[PDB]
Amino acid sequence: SMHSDLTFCEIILMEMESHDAAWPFLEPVNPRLVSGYRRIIKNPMDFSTMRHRLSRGGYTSSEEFAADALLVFDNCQTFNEDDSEVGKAGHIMRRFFESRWEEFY
Numbered sequence: 014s015m016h017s018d019l020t021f022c023e024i025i026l027m028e029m030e031s032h033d034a035a036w037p038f039l040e041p042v043n044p045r046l047v048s049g050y051r052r053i054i055k056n057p058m059d060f061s062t063m064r065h066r067l068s069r070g071g072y073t074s075s076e077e078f079a080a081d082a083l084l085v086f087d088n089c090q091t092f093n094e095d096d097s098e099v100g101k102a103g104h105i106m107r108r109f110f111e112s113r114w115e116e117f118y
């Protein structure tokens with residue numbers, strides 16, 4: 014299970030999931046809603062997957078957690094146009110994450 018030293022990451026993830034721009038990223042990108050995603054995106058990532066990995070002890074370090082968060086946003090800017098709703102959401106959430114992270118780093 015998660016080590017207590019990573020509780021600040023747990024909270025950051027919780028706060029990201031509650032964000033108004035979080036809706037595209039709560040669950041894995043859904044093939045029922047869009048085609049060709051995993052054709053392009055080699056390592057999908059989403060907040061639910063991160064939440065379970067963190068809670069079960071699958072992140073040894075905060076940097077691995079941060080790498081998966083940045084992966085959510087990097088995938089988003091890879092697949093989506095910047096002026097699409099999901100693309101704009103990704104830019105918002107990246108700013109939110111980096112501002113939360115810099116309180117600690």
Ligand SMILES: CC(=O)c1c(C)[nH]c(-c2csc(N3CCNCC3)n2)c1C1CCCC1
Nearest residue numbers: 036037038042043046047050089092093099
């Ligand atoms: C391709 C992509 O990068 C997406 C991300 C990170 N997210 C969502 C997305 C859009 S709508 C939504 N959801 C609300 C309903 N319940 C399931 C989740 N996710 C997408 C696409 C799926 C449809 C078109 C955009």
Ligand SMILES: CC(=O)c1c(C)[nH]c(-c2csc(N3CCNCC3)n2)c1C1CCCC1
Nearest residue numbers: 035036037043045046047097098099100102
């Ligand atoms: C329900 C669903 O599977 C969706 C798909 C295929 N696409 C969008 C989608 C793309 S953009 C957008 N919104 C802009 C206008 N009003 C607020 C929400 N919803 C959704 C929902 C997720 C919550 C909102 C609808």
